[PDB]
Amino acid sequence: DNIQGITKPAIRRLARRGGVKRISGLIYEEVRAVLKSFLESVIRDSVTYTEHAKRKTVTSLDVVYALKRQGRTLYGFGG
DNA sequence: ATAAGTCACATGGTGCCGAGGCCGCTCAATTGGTCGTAGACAGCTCTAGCACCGCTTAAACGCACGTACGCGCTGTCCCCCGCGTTTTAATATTAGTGTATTTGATTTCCGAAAGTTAAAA
């Protein structure tokens, strides 16, 4: 629906940051696959956090929290 | 001439206006003091260590050597992209409503604490 919004030139630019200088196609659609997996996992964690807080605004507190839970502590925004 | 009197003078004092000078109330967390209990300890004994020999022959290392194997080789297939181009959708602006959070006053909630005792190798 909008995973295509993460588009092939955009992931090309990501891969320029990655240091590549040749990239085939199917790389692209599966980069969308891995991004889907990452987003849904962390989103589920933050969602569970807020809904246990009986709130309905998943919040950066719960996002940095879900990230630390996933094992990677994004860092700079409180936390 | 002088007691009465008017008069102006001279000083009194009373009233109001800032204003710079002390003061009053509160909350931080210190430190003062004090109970009661973790902590280090006080004789201690015995654990599994870790040597300390004293064997054996099971691994193991080299001695040989051999296919397997690698590693660039090499025609060539192929694919990625560097752009060039049209698209194309990503800007990033307002917006009010529609809960989302939210912070008061409770107001029950419930388990830590204090008995009392069940159970327990």
UniProtKB/Swiss-Prot annotation:
Sequence positions bearing N6-succinyllysine: K8, K54
Keyword Transcription regulation: no
Modified sites of kind Omega-N-methylarginine: R32
Record localization: Nucleus; Chromosome
Role according to the record: Core component of nucleosome. Nucleosomes wrap and compact DNA into chromatin, limiting DNA accessibility to the cellular machineries which require DNA as a template. Histones thereby play a central role in transcription regulation, DNA repair, DNA replication and chromosomal stability. DNA accessibility is regulated via a complex set of post-translational modifications of histones, also called histone code, and nucleosome remodeling.
Note: Present with 524000 molecules/cell in log phase SD medium.
Protein name, as recorded: Histone H4
Originating organism: Saccharomyces cerevisiae (strain ATCC 204508 / S288c) (Baker's yeast)
Gene that this sequence comes from: HHF1
